[PDB]
Amino acid sequence: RLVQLSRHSIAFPSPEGALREPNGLLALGGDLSPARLLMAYQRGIFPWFSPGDPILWWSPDPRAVLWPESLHISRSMKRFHKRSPYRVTMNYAFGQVIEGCASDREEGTWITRGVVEAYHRLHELGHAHSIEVWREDELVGGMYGVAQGTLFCGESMFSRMENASKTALLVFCEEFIGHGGKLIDCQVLNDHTASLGACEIPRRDYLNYLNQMRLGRLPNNFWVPRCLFSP
């Protein structure tokens, strides 16, 4: 299997052909052009690879996902948010947010300048979005991802101050479900993501949901840059 892409085509092989180990490895090569990424997200595929390696494309089985309404907020966090010291915005500083996720030397080490430029293009074309957390005038956290109708693909999140991440995710979810949102894609289940309510589901089911929710929509102004939470 494992198809090798090229500049001559933006089409990917079927997700069902992905490898078992590593989980979901479907293709390598191509580029991070706006059209190829959209095609990918449209088919439940996403790019991830370490700096120095060719572009690797995935669609694991199972797929880690998060039902907005199932977001788990600790009793402590709720008390924290009740008197939150942060304010949350939407699409105010995408560059800073993705650069925030990049600078942390962990899972975000895969975010190279090439990746940053690629997603900043999707954000400029209106498909990639960011939620920003502010402490005074400083960005202390947030998250970003690619929208797919009523489905949201969460690429990553970062935090430079206690409870910043949870805040962005807490408020976003309220906003999301409040206006039609139905699902958040987390790709691969991990400890932190699992502690927040993320659960695994068969890839085939994820695909069902995806081509089902990508043709849906949220209010015309749902992604317009604005303030989301401010006491």
Added chain:
Amino acid sequence: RLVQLSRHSIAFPSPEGALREPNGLLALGGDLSPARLLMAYQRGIFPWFSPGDPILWWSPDPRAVLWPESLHISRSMKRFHKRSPYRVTMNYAFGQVIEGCASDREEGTWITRGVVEAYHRLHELGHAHSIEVWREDELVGGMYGVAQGTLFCGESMFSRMENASKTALLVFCEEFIGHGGKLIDCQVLNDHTASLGACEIPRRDYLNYLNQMRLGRLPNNFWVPRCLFSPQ
């Protein structure tokens, strides 16, 4: 005659009182704010002016239009599309399409940073849409415009590869016709648009349709980003 708009009011004068030559010159000034732009379209007025000049608003008589079903496709163009090398999408890259038209260097030269931002806002707001044509991984054409119910005002289109904009309009028309689309506004006829089957009707007639179709409605999700046609 012809009025100076004000940053104060977002209202327009009766299109029927426009000049004959230059055809349709109705007003000047104002700004390109969403509210005002959206209002002009509602009234069958559109902005057009060269860099350096003040905003100019127009409503020509006659008006150029295109009945979707009457789109003319040559026999060799059908042969081409039958085995098409292009991919067509909706709202995948409005900014790139508009910049593509601005780069035309013929008359896309009126499209300044200001005009681009103004139409970008209407896109952000969901009133302006684009149709992209891809060849492999490259954007080779497309068109963008403002939706007005079952009426669509085609602002402009561009081509970087043979038959690109024709397949853009061909695929769009099929999509548009299939879900309730009634008319495409072309503003002012030009050899190319004329070969595609566009024609001229009296301004009072166009306005008549406009006021009828702006009430019409297409599927609630007609404009969400998606692929409309995939090559083979």
